[PDB]
Design a protein around this ligand. Structure first.
Ligand SMILES: COc1cc(N2C(=O)N(Cc3c(F)cc(F)cc3F)c3ncccc3S2(=O)=O)cnc1OC
Ligand SMILES: CCCCCCCC/C=C\CCCCCCCC(=O)O
Ligand SMILES: CCCCCCCC/C=C\CCCCCCCC(=O)O
Ligand SMILES: CCCCCCCC/C=C\CCCCCCCC(=O)O
Ligand SMILES: CCCCCCCC/C=C\CCCCCCCC(=O)O
Length: 510
């Protein structure tokens, strides 16, 4: 008649010493999370492996984010519910090593996968080469993440130990970390806080802040304002009216709008090109509007060409938003001879209103301007810009209306891409924020406990064990939350969630 088999009876003989009866609010909260995390995360894998349009690098990682969340929801979640209520280990020495090893590996996989998503997004949106990763490269990085996590969390499995604690007189079994010397655990739990929480979050905040700044602000094209409908009449009716205001008659109009910079916007390239062209009879067919302020030398050069030629006009005063809109929907060509332009907001603004851009083949403008929607040249070459202004005149003897419609369709198509990339970043950023808030209490509490040595001398252990149990539930709640973020913030996931639910209950879609 051996009593080694029964640990639950020994817990009943001690149950009176530490009652809680907030156990029902924790059991209810653990069941709710268990169902939502298991249903939601499996739907994530299914929705990606069903639809081949969904197999993007961002989503393949998101599946590897749900694979680790299903692993803990099954193996680690029920064991945490029992321990945080009974304060006893009922699962034996072998599972005292495996279960905590499975949740440290899962926390490492989750931090490194979220960092690779930010990394992949930054190399695709911010890096000047605009890298386009493949599904093969995303799966090999996924394999490596699991290999790395399984190695770096091996010391945790060695350290866990299941021991019977004798001090009323009825002993009970517990599973905890057991280190030799109080010097190694403080070193390790610093390295755990860094690799799993601190270092990834600082990396992702720095990568997503550059992604937010580019997509929201630097590429923030307001299509509600830069629109064709705000104009009146036909384009040649607006052009000749505009020229007559500056004392010019009809002619192919060229427009520059930008600061007079020494190295950047490139008005010095345009000023050099006008002097090249000024020696030709084709010059008197052209009209130039140079709008800008800045370097005093280039100003004097622009006012010197303005005095000499009657088809050059320089505007140095501050222009209203609607005024630049009137120019874009009037002039024939807009010249952007930039040395450095990583966003090309001027091109999107001008093409949306019909202007045909003659721009440098630099990153922001090279992406937007194609072979059928404008003319590209070398950034620092005034002679190649002079040739392009001659080609724009030759083309302007025919009807340019076909090119204007291509420009409007290309700038709108490019704004759709920005708006699509924006929604994906906003969704990923919420996931990160929710990851930060969910792991914040348990990461801080384990640093204060294991490194700083807090909670050792207790004033009241109820509040400390309550905060510990609450923070532990929040970690599994993060696995419940992410599929809800995908449903609220991604239309591709939302419809695929509805199609998998309709098949599962009704069989109505498939
Ligand atoms: C599920 O069951 C058990 C879990 C644990 N552990 C644990 O509570 N945490 C808390 C924790 C964090 F601090 C940070 C974080 F990002 C995620 C976490 F979950 C650990 N904290 C530091 C190192 C290793 C672990 S841990 O081994 O995962 C211990 N004993 C168990 O059962 C006997
Ligand atoms: C105490 C130090 C422990 C070191 C843990 C740091 C783990 C980082 C190592 C590998 C992370 C895997 C990144 C895979 C590269 C893929 C790049 C990509 O395409 O995003
Ligand atoms: C001593 C503990 C070592 C055993 C770790 C096993 C982890 C694994 O499954 O590879
Ligand atoms: C500073 C903010 C983010 C740093 C981005 C990481 C550095 C990547 C360098 C690009 C490269 O390796 O070619
Ligand atoms: C205590 C720590 C976590 C409990 C989770 C809170 C959710 C409770 C479920 C809702 C309820 O039944 O009141």
């Amino acid at each position: 008649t051996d009593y080694d088999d029964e640990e639950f009876l020994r817990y009943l003989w001690r149950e009176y010493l530490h009652p809680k009866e907030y156990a029902w609010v924790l059991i209810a909260g653990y069941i709710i999370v268990f169902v939502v995390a298991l249903i939601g995360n499996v739907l994530v894998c299914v929705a990606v492996w069903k639809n081949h349009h969904m197999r993007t690098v961002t989503n393949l990682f998101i599946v590897n984010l749900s694979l680790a969340a299903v692993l803990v929801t099954i193996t680690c979640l029920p064991a945490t519910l029992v321990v945080d209520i009974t304060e006893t280990w009922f699962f034996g020495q072998s599972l005292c090593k495996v279960i905590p090893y499975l949740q440290t590996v899962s926390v490492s996989v989750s931090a490194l996968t979220l960092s690779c998503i930010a990394l992949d997004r930054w190399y695709a949106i911010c890096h000047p080469l605009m890298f386009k990763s493949t599904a093969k490269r995303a799966l090999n990085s996924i394999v490596i993440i699991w290999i790395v996590s399984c190695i770096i969390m091996i010391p945790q499995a060695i350290v866990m130990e299941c021991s019977t604690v004798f001090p009323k007189t009825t002993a009970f079994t517990v599973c905890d970390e057991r280190w030799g010397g109080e010097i190694a655990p403080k070193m390790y739990h610093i390295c755990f806080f860094l690799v799993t929480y601190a270092a990834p979050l600082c990396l992702m905040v720095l990568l997503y802040l550059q992604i937010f700044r580019k997509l929201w602000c630097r590429q923030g094209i307001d299509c509600s304002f830069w629109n064709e409908s705000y104009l009146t009449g036909s384009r040649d009716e607006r052009k000749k009216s505009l020229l007559s205001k500056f004392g010019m008659d009809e002619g192919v109009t060229f427009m520059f709008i930008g600061r007079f910079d020494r190295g950047q916007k490139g008005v010095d390239v345009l000023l050099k090109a006008i002097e090249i062209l000024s020696s030709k009879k084709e010059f008197q067919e052209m009209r130039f509007i140079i709008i800008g302020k800045g370097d005093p030398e280039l100003e004097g050069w622009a006012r010197s060409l303005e005095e000499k030629h009657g088809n050059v006009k320089v505007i140095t005063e501050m222009l209203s938003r609607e005024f630049v809109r009137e120019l874009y929907g009037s002039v024939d060509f807009v010249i952007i001879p930039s040395y450095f332009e990583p966003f090309g907001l001027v091109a999107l603004e001008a093409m949306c209103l019909g202007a045909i851009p003659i721009a440098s083949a630099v990153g922001g403008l090279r992406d937007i301007i194609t072979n059928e929607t404008g003319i590209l040249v070398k950034a620092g070459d005034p002679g190649e810009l002079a040739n392009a202004i001659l080609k724009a005149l030759e083309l302007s003897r025919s009807d340019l209306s076909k090119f204007r419609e291509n420009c409007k369709k290309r700038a709108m198509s490019f704004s759709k891409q920005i708006r699509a990339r924006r929604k994906t970043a906003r969704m990923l950023m919420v996931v990160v924020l929710v990851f930060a808030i969910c792991y914040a209490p348990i990461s801080i509490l384990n640093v204060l406990k294991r490194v700083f040595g807090m909670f050792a001398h207790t004033e009241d252990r109820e509040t400390v064990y309550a905060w510990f149990a609450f923070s532990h539930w929040l970690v599994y709640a993060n696995s419940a939350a992410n599929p809800i973020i995908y449903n609220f913030l991604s239309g591709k996931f939302r419809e695929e969630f509805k199609a998998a639910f309709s098949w599962w209950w009704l069989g109505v879609h498939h």
